[PDB]
Design a protein around this nucleic acid. Sequence first.
DNA 1: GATCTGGCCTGTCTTACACAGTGGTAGTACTCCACTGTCTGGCTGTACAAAAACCCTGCAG
Length: 351
Amino acid sequence: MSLQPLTAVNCGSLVQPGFSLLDLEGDVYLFGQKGWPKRSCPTGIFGVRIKKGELKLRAISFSNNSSYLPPLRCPAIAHFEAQDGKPECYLIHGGRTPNNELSSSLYMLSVDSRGCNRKVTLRCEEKELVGDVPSARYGHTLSVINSRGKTACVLFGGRSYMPPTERTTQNWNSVVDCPPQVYLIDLEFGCCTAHTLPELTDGQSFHVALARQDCVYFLGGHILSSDCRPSRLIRLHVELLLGSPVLTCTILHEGLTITSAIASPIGYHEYIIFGGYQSETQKRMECTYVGLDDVGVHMESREPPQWTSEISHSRTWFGGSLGKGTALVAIPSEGNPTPPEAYHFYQVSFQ
DNA sequence: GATCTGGCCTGTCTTACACAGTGGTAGTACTCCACTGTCTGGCTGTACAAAAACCCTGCAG
Ligand SMILES: [Ca+2]
């Protein structure tokens, strides 16, 4: 629980406030970049390295038989555990296009090989969605669950632009909470199913969810319709029966008022929720620790690593999970004139 | 310790971005001075005729 100011040696204008961090098979891969893929790296995905505070960003590449992806803005992420038939998978859907727009498409990502010089080759595959597909949305959450004993995907949350009939020029950029009906997805086949929940009467965004032993727990839960940040955690439990995937839900009395959190898994289930915003302008300073058992969530705090007055006074911030007690956060920087490297970086560590 | 190779640096070539706006100066194409004498067409006192659109009336249905 201590921070360290970094400096990106170069390439300090390709990161945008919304983006994703995926640690898979060693190195960390950043997804989502300001502007369309520059011809430096038509991949649109960067390898990251942290050497003596220096932030180094390398170019990556996919296969020939791989699909090429638009750099989604703030998609949903799922770390599908390494198993048959294809270990290990990263399921993404569906973010916002840098050409400002949504894609209800769903991508599956894996690693291919190495090096031959420690270089990393990747592979992307779209999936047609037999559904009952959820329309395009963003800020939602996708998760993986393993129920008796097969693997399925749970999709819930997020908002979207106006319904297409109500798409109004002067209400175009506005966005309303997508209706609260969860979606169950088999990775194969891409048969998507919709399901209703009589207790989840409202959509929500940016609520970091967690999955464990085919049981899902939603923390956070900021909502537009009521301007509320209901701390109350939401648990649900699914049993994958053929062909009725039975589903149940339940309210928890207490969770936490977190919005767009950064989740670092340190142990197999020792998680720390790092930061976000506790109120509409009041960012969350403190850290929080959650132990995740079949008993459930178990809550505690840690010491908040002292934020230098720069970040502690900065209006907004964000970051991602470098993983394993380590995470990255960024600060919108000022200047006269702008450097224009307007983002400082704090590498934060647990223990 | 020899070898190799992706990734990085230098140098390269290409597409953008401020330079308007303000005053003094000059050539130059377009317009009233005075002097003129003349003509048309509005003005004016009533009386005379000609159109116009209705309102009554009368015959007709
Ligand atoms: Ca210009």
